[PDB]
Design a protein around this nucleic acid. Structure first.
Lengths: 98, 91
DNA sequence: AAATTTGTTGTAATTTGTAGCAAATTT
DNA sequence: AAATTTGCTACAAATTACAACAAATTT
């Protein structure tokens, strides 16, 4: 049949292992490190906007990449993403994607 | 100038930071490449699911299970936070 | 010329926030 | 014992979806 591909491996950045050997690795692992570092490199100062902080860093390059793919076509990009065309528009405005 | 980043070695064994968004973008460049016109039905709920999970895990790790403390770190509401833990069943 | 997509509605469906209380847990 | 956190629970408010349409643009 077809081999399984668990949701972790659907979106993967490529890393380098103990030997000089390139290898895919789930994206969530990168989010994991970004925060391991974010906490380490912060040390004591409180934060109150971590979700929105994270959200932005993700939302932008998604929108960026989907609009690239639909060569600017908002209707289809909004279908691809599964959000309404109206909320896509609002996001893009938020991120000055215009 | 930028707070969310990830370490990257290059061919000269020099580790070096770069923003998480660059990494996200790659992920997608690659996603699309694979599918040859297979339509994507819910790409947002997918990505979001790949980002929420590890964020939930790490704040809960940081706040030592303290939901009240986490939900205030993130800027969401405890209710929401509980509801998202349910979504991925981290409970 | 035809089919699609945009920009713009008001309106309704859903999700998140608010607060407040007794019970459980940490301090 | 006192303080903090949990697991609820209406209800309010903010966000998202809907659906319609002329006008703009693409095919």
């Amino acid at each position: 049949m077809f081999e399984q591909r668990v949701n972790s491996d659907v979106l993967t950045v490529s890393t380098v292992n103990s030997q000089d050997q390139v290898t895919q690795k789930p994206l969530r692992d990168s989010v994991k490190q970004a925060l391991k570092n974010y906490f380490a490199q912060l040390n004591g100062q409180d934060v109150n906007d971590l979700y929105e902080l994270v959200l932005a860093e993700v939302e932008q390059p998604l929108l960026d990449m989907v609009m690239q793919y639909t060569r600017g076509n908002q209707t289809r990009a909004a279908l691809m993403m599964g959000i309404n065309r109206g909320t896509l528009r609002k996001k893009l405005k938020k991120y000055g994607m215009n």
